Write a protein that binds this ligand. Structure first.
Ligand SMILES: *Cc1c(COP(=O)(O)O)cnc(C)c1O
Ligand SMILES: *Cc1c(COP(=O)(O)O)cnc(C)c1O
Lengths: 421, 421
């Protein structure tokens, strides 16, 4: 009752000068200053929402306010990519010396970001077991623990975390729980903030954008996590970039999203650009319609793939006899995303053959386009790893990953049948 | 003493809402109506320049006002291309039964437009001889003559017309003289309105655009030609699209550019789109700088080509022995555009060979890019005419057309020398 209307209207009222119905693109680097006073105010953070700059573009501003509305959150901040949003978030609450605790069931790229990049910058990422229990989160946390990280639907095995208990635990302890909600389609399938996460992160490049046209990421702040504790000196310190201003004092419950902007984004410069933000808004306008058709296509193909003689198994979490099926229902109302996995009975060789017979389905490594995508990681993504380190990563040699698009399901059935022969 | 500043500022003040320094792109189909009264006014032509619509876009509006300023004119109107600007102009002042008189030294596409398209819609185009003398215009004029057409620099001989005398003659007769000023680089090299033309037309796709990136055209109105004479019932009639409004009464000296918008553009729909307009404004920003380097490069190469053993002749109206050299001086301050022509002494074959040895210069049919362009019309553009109907068109079989770009003239010399062996 309302997502459908937010995704068309939240964050933008027709611009007063032109009364344009569509959001304008402001391919600008700069904004003339209304007066020296307004200009003094901008640099002092005294007129926050109202003066535009190299770090708040008005086209990007619509995207942000809209995303916050779609996630049930209070404010959002866009960046040049999902990776840059994860990095800017973590780097806003943590500095060299700190650590964070993460599920290890991570998107290939976020694993490496944790293990190599953050490590090098003196931010220790400690990993839970693959079952990512709240106990193990708690067990790994100490005075310098700065966040816990988990994904709405985890990387290789498509597990759903134990989100309610995780959130209660993190809050109980006073750690910011951050959920990478990319697989929750912008809050449509799931809003982690509603279940008590502190912060959400997205690769908008995937289903929010939707059309495989732009790379983009975002952080969404619920505005309800106490930064005051003593766990977040970075948020409470007087701020050297702003002449000793205290962000928790000037901005209260929004101090995080404000800091990520005026400090992290200001210094590191992962600007999302305005055309790109504009192209995201376009895909956001149909987010719920694509979401629904995605998830229906995915269920249908999950069932169908099992009835197939050449298929050993299928891993979608919305299948009835799945490990985490109760969780699919609790969190995603029965609709846990649009990525499934399946093993071929003819193994690695047959998986390779299947990819080579694809015609309509595209052979590539992304997820979340309108078009249906397939990859055989064992021969591709992870082909640099030995089979033993592969199996180590949860990558089984006969597994194909399907990111199910919006084509007619009968056309997809015909294609899969052909490719599987 | 001002063109340089006009091409950066005319037509746009930072939008009051965002104070954007760059001009926004308004990729919008519509504008919300402020109130029903404002909407009544828009449809009645009552608050002309102030309310935006599908036929006045604000990004396109900046390009128009800016071009009018660069031409010394009063108002302009943009279209989806140079052809469409020419068709919309002629179709605004002429209807079935009328005729117009034109030089026949026309850009390839405009010839066809006159001879096939206009003819079929019952608008007769009568041709002067190749010397386009004002008295030949007069000779061909009658009660129903609606305009005279000439180009600032005609094709293919690169003749410059007898512009002052032509303009006096047309005005003394009360016919609209229209100059296709494309080769005048948006008013930079020449402003026909300053010499008394009624209207100017451009293929913005060429030097005004400048980067070969966008197709675009425009009409520019001097706002000083009397339409009330009885020669222009189309302009004075009560107007059936607007409940019998008389455009000469409501808009006085701007009635033509207004009609072209609210009537011809509204019915025919050659909209220039706003990205495209935005990209033109970007090239307009450097027009004068490109213009000067173009014309310098052209002179140097015109001289250099004559010293070349393999070159029989060079046609460039800025060479000092040229027929119409006095005219280059009167009209273009010594700088008559950036297209030249030259014949190879090894004829058609050597011309084909030269084009086949180009590396840096691009082989294509088009003028006015930043990059230097070459074509051999006898083997290409006109390859379907017999040699004698070729010679008839002024297309001699050894002629190469060079549209001279902005690369370093020494690199161009090294390339030509070597293409010419
Ligand atoms: C893509 C991805 C990332 C970050 O992606 P970008 O390509 O930088 O936008 C993070 N998390 C998930 C779940 C993703 O699939
Ligand atoms: C190209 C051209 C035209 C029209 O050009 P478009 O490609 O439609 O924009 C008209 N006159 C001249 C002199 C031109 O070179």
């Amino acid at each position: 009752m309302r997502f459908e209307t937010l995704q068309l209207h939240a964050g933008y009222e027709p611009e007063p000068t032109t009364l344009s119905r569509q959001v304008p693109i402001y391919p600008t680097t700069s904004y003339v200053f209304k007066s020296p006073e307004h200009a003094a105010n901008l640099f002092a953070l005294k007129e926050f929402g109202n003066i535009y700059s190299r770090i708040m573009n008005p086209t990007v501003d619509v995207l942000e306010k809209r995303l916050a509305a779609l996630e049930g959150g209070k404010a959002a901040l866009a960046t040049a990519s999902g990776h840059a949003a994860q990095f800017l978030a973590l780097t806003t609450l943590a500095q060299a010396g700190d650590n964070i605790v993460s599920t290890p069931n991570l998107y290939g790229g976020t694993f490496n970001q944790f293990k190599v990049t953050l490590k090098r910058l003196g931010i220790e990422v400690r990993f839970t077991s693959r079952e990512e229990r709240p106990e193990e989160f708690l067990a790994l946390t100490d005075e310098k623990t700065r966040a816990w990280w988990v994904e709405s639907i985890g990387n290789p095995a498509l597990n759903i975390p134990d989100l309610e208990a995780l959130a209660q635990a993190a809050r109980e302890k006073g750690v910011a729980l951050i959920v990478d909600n990319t697989f929750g389609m912008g809050g449509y399938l799931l809003r982690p903030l509603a279940w008590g996460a502190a912060l959400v992160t997205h690769s908008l490049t995937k289903w929010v954008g939707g059309h495989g046209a732009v790379i983009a990421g975002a952080i969404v702040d619920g505005g309800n996590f106490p930064w005051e504790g003593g766990r977040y000196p970075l948020l409470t310190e007087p701020q050297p970039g702003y002449h000793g201003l205290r962000l928790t004092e000037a901005f209260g419950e929004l101090a995080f999203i404000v800091k990520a902007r005026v400090d992290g984004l200001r210094d590191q410069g992962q600007a999302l650009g305005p055309f790109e933000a504009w192209v995201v808004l376009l895909g956001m306008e149909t987010l719920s319609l694509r979401a629904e058709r995605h998830v229906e296509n995915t269920l249908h193909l999950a069932h169908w793939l099992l009835e197939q003689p050449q298929v050993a198994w299928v891993n979608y979490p919305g299948l009835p006899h799945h490990p985490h099926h109760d969780r699919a229902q609790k969190y995603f109302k029965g609709k846990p995303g649009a990525v499934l996995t399946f093993g071929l009975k003819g193994g690695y060789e047959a998986a390779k053959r299947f990819i080579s017979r694809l015609k309509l389905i595209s052979h590539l490594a992304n997820v979340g386009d309108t078009r249906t995508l397939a990859i055989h990681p064992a021969s591709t993504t992870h082909s640099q790893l030995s089979p033993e380190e592969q199996a180590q990563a949860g990558v089984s040699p006969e597994m194909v990953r399907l990111s199910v698009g919006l084509e007619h399901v009968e056309d997809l059935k015909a294609e899969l049948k052909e490719a599987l022969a």
